[PDB]
Amino acid sequence: LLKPRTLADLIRILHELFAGVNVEEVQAVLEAYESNPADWALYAKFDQYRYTRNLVDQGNGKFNLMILCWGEGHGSSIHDHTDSHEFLKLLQGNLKETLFDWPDKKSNEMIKKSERTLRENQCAYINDSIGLHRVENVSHTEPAVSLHLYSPPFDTCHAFDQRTGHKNKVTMTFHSKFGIRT
Ligand SMILES: [Fe+3]
C-alpha cells in the first residue's frame, strides 16, 4: 500500500487492490492521494444546472471511478447505493454529506442521522448497511470537484422524498467518459 503520487498512480494501485475488497485500504489510498488539478483537469467538466458525472476508469469491470463537478448550490438527491460501496474524495472545494436512516414503510418525514462538511482531500465511505445520504455543494461562490469510486459498478439507484420516505428508481447519467463529452 503505497502513496499515489498522481491520479494515474492511484488508478494503478486501485487495479491491484481490486484484483480479487478491503474497504479500509481503499479509503487509505484515496486519502493519501493529494489532489493535483493538473492530473484531473481533463475530467472537470461542469454544467450550469446540476452536478455532472465524468467517467475516468472502468476498473477492469471491478469498479467505476468518476469525477463529479458541482456548481454552486448543486446537490444530489437522498439516495442509496444499490448493494455496492461508494468512496468519495474531495479534489477541490467542499461538500456537505447528510446521513439519513432507511425509512419505515409508513409515509413520514425522513430521519436525519448526522451531517458533516468534507473539505479538500478528505474522504467519506458509505454502503447500504450504513444508511442513505445526500451530497451537496452548499457554497455560493466556489465549485466543488470530487472523486467517486463505486464497487461493484452500478447504473441505477433510488432517490428518496424527504417528506415521505418514498423512493423512485433513477439511472445515473454520464456527462463525459474518458474526457469525451457524451
Ligand atoms: Fe452516494
From Swiss-Prot:
Keywords (alphabetical) are:
Dioxygenase, Iron, Metal-binding, Oxidoreductase, Thioether bond
| Pfam families with a match to the protein in the record | CDO_I
Cofactors (names)? Fe cation; Ni(2+); Zn(2+)
Q: In which tissues is it expressed?
A: Highest levels in liver. Significant expression also in kidney, lung and brain.
Query: EC?
Result: 1.13.11.20
Electron transport recorded as keyword: no
Q: Where is this cross-link: 3'-(S-cysteinyl)-tyrosine (Cys-Tyr)?
A: 86-150
Q: Does the keyword Iron apply?
A: yes
The record's note on quaternary structure and interaction partners says: Monomer.
What job does the chain carry out?
Catalyzes the oxidation of cysteine to cysteine sulfinic acid with addition of molecular dioxygen.
Question: Which protein is depicted?
Answer: Cysteine dioxygenase type 1
Annotated source species: Rattus norvegicus
